[PDB]
A paper describes a structure:
We also determined the structure of PPZ1cat bound to the marine toxin microcystin-LR (MC [PPZ1cat-MC]), a potent cyclic peptide inhibitor of PP1 (20). Both the MC-free and MC-bound structures of PPZ1cat are highly similar, with an RMSD of 0.54 Å. The largest difference is in the β12-β13 loop, which contains Cys438PPZ1. This cysteine forms a covalent bond with the bound MC identical to that observed in the PP1α-MC complex. Unexpectedly, the Z1-helix is also no longer ordered in the PPZ1cat-MC structure. This was not due to MC binding, but instead the Z1-helix was displaced by a symmetry-related molecule in the crystal. Importantly, the positions of L1 are identical between the PPZ1cat and PPZ1cat-MC structures, demonstrating that the conformation of L1 is intrinsic to PPZ1cat itself and not a consequence of Z1-helix binding. MC binds the active site of PPZ1cat essentially identically to that observed in PP1α. The orientation observed in PPZ1cat-MC is favored because a malonate ion from the crystallization mother liquor is bound in the rotomer position populated in the PP1α structure; thus both positions are expected to be equally likely in the absence of malonate.
Here, we describe the structure and function of the first member of a family of protein phosphatases that is specific to fungi, protein phosphatase Z1 (PPZ1) from Candida albicans. Like other fungus-specific phosphatases, C. albicans PPZ1 (484 amino acids [aa], 54.4 kDa) has two domains: an N-terminal intrinsically disordered protein (IDP) domain (aa 1 to 170 [PPZ1Nterm]) and a C-terminal catalytic domain (aa 171 to 484 [PPZ1cat]). PPZ1cat and human PP1α exhibit 66% sequence identity throughout their catalytic domains, and the 6 residues that coordinate the active site metals are 100% conserved.
Residue numbers in the entry:
A (entry chain M): 1 to 7
B (entry chain A): 172 to 438, 442 to 464
Write the structure that this text describes.
């Protein structure tokens, strides 16, 4: 979820 | 004096000291990137390693957790190491993380190995933190010296002719291992092609062998892709990283592939490190999130 480039 | 630079880096790591400036001067950082780059270029794009060896996944600048890995799994050179990439970005100590790994590479060139991850390139570091960390804590010239070093990192490793190690995964155009050997270095990472796939792709339980990857680039490959790849090259296991997994490591497709992720509490996942014995037995050591 940190941004899908990837939680 | 590579020994003193390691002691300085590990001093800051043992104490947890957190400072804007790196414990190494920019002139020392420059010499480290120069020696490592030369060592990387003198070794193949596809490494062939013999066991025993321990395999480490994504670290992503979590320097304290790199210290925990070495403290628990053993410091070089009594433990032989293969890192699968993704050393920088996200973590607030990407500089200490990559600097310690490069120093160990300089000191133990034949017992310590670092593969390239998809974050070890110019464009990804500009988006995900390591560019800004170099600009704030060092300078842009130092960041360029790291990218020059990244562009020489090897792409994959084969352990005892049976374990294929890569950061991301497989590719529809991985038709021979020499295609990995013949990857010219130094090189940037293109938006497409075999090199991009090896650093960006992920496994999945999909209906089709190849599908576009939700990350926005490269592919996701199915169990069929793994089976065909292991059969064609006579490998027993694909060992890769790239993907965060809750229990630190996760086998896939009847234990024909394993993901090793070594950055605890990345988003509250465990961290894991895979050991390969002389008889090619695979065990794991865990790193708790907190
Ligand atoms: Mn990755
Ligand atoms: Mn990663």
């Amino acid at each position: 979820x940190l941004x899908r480039x990837x939680x | 004096d590579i020994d003193s630079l390691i002691d300085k880096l590990l001093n800051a790591g043992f104490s947890g000291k957190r400072t804007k400036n790196v414990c190494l001067k920019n002139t020392e950082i420059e010499l480290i990137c120069a020696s490592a780059r030369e060592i990387f270029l003198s070794q193949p794009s596809l490494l062939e390693l013999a066991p025993p060896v321990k395999v480490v996944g994504d670290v992503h600048g979590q320097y304290h957790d790199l210290i925990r890995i070495f403290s628990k799994c053993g410091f070089p050179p009594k433990t032989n190491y293969l890192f699968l990439g993704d050393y920088v970005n996200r973590g607030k100590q990407s500089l200490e993380t990559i600097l310690l790994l490069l120093c160990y590479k300089i000191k133990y060139p034949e017992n310590f190995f670092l593969l390239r991850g998809n974050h070890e390139c110019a464009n990804v570091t500009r988006v995900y933190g390591f560019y800004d960390e170099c600009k704030r804590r060092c300078n842009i010239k130092t960041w360029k010296l790291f990218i020059d070093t990244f562009n020489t990192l090897p792409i994959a490793a084969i352990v005892a002719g049976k374990i294929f190690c890569v950061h991301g995964g497989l590719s529809p155009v991985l038709n021979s291992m020499d295609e990995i050997r013949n990857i010219a270095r130094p090189t940037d990472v293109p938006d497409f092609g075999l090199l991009n796939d090896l650093l960006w792709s992920d496994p999945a339980d999909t209906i089709n062998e190849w599908e576009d990857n939700e990350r926005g680039v490269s592919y996701v490959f199915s169990k069929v892709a793994i089976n065909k790849f292991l059969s064609k090259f006579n490998f027993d296991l694909v060992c890769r990283a790239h993907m965060v997994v809750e229990d630190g490591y996760e086998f896939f497709n009847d234990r024909t592939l394993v993901t090793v992720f070594s950055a605890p509490n990345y988003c509250d996942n465990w961290g894991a490190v895979m050991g390969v014995s002389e008889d090619l037995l695979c065990s794991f050591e865990l790193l708790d999130p907190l």
